Symmetry: D2
């Protein structure tokens, strides 16, 4: 079960009222909202994009998540982030959700960005800013 | 257009990727998620509830919002909160969303809680903890 | 309590698992999702826009809702829609959510579109297709 | 690319205005909302639970999705569902989203339920109604 140390960058995301579903914990779907929020915050601040903005955007082609221990609004949650592999027009992220002050991830997942030209949605090489920012998150 | 000073308690809520809709700003529906997140965080920390928890819960019977200037993930947003009137089993909140470092609210709204017994959903007097916490937010 | 026949156009919206919150009913915030889903669907089929395409878009400047009886996934909900006032760059919608087939509205709400130039977001006259479509919904 | 007939049970889900994100298609995260909406609807009609009522509930322990072609509100989407493995307190669902009427799946995904006692959240044998219903969806 993944550990804080195995991740390079960390982001706190506040939990919301309706994050809880009928069974009292954060809905399993919400984890992915946390995933792509966490990644794109990093791409925005440390990487250029430009979501309003640029002619290059990231498209999610796959994701997946595993769930180990539940969590609940209003607990304070944070995301570890790391980059696993990094092709030319694509990249693969590893994310995990940590409850504040815990060594053990509550869930952990991966997802894959393909960067494309906005209008054409055809793949492109990753612009240097982003590619360097992305690289900085590699183990 | 409502001002920071006119509100008693303030809460920062991080914005999320998909808070933006097709037109590039935070969706108008999301403001209400911010409203009830903000209120219930306060009720949870400073008031008792106990959403897992208690035999008394808050039901939203009305809300409404006005929108003045747009805002966007990943901007950092915060909620002013104040209590306007406070009956016996009910209460009326005034909320506004502020972009960090701005005097002017970007939107502002109200909503009404009726507190009820969990099982019976029949109104109750507000328990002393909550009532005192609520009162503390009165002008 | 608003009734089915006080409304001119109806859409079915399917409820979703996470529509329900911790307390077991559709969250109050989801009601507004139903509202602008329901309006915008009408605008799209019977009115022109062109949400990717158009040079003119609708901004929500205000909204409000009242809640009468709760509802839950997986019930079958549907939306009554009517138009109340119709200025020249502005319009006012009246909405009610009905559970199938009950005559009484579960909740009822209002909201306001202002149409603007996409780029400049400055108000404009409502294009004839839209205004014709809108007026169609006037009582 | 998974095809309609590789799936045993189908549900229509209506798309919603905010389904689309800043880039104009249904957000990748919404796909999972469709998944557990679609499973849970089946469990509710054809299988017993009893999400308010029941002493046994389904936990999502994992999920994954692949995206092939994008989609947008207000298109008409529908979900193929089939069951892959079926242990005794566990089950594995296979899901695909289809745009009406195309033979190719827009995206395809998997997810895992583990059934537990509501209070103790310790695994249990799947109640005969559910397991009968589940097995019905086995290829």
């Amino acid at each position: 079960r993944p550990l804080r140390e195995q991740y390079l960058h960390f982001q706190p995301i506040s939990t919301r009222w309706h994050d809880n579903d009928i069974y009292g914990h954060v809905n399993n779907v919400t984890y992915y909202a946390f995933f792509d929020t966490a990644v794109n915050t990093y791409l925005i601040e440390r990487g250029g994009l430009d979501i309003q903005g640029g002619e290059v955007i990231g498209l999610v082609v796959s994701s997946s998540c595993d769930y180990f221990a539940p969590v609940a609004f209003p607990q304070r949650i944070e995301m570890g982030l790391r980059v696993a592999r990094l092709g030319n027009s694509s990249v693969q992220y590893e994310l995990a959700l940590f409850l504040e002050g815990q060594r053990e991830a509550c869930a952990a997942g991966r997802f894959v960005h393909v960067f494309v030209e906005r209008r054409s949605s055809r793949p492109v090489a990753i612009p240097q800013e982003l590619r360097d920012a992305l690289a900085a998150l590699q183990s």
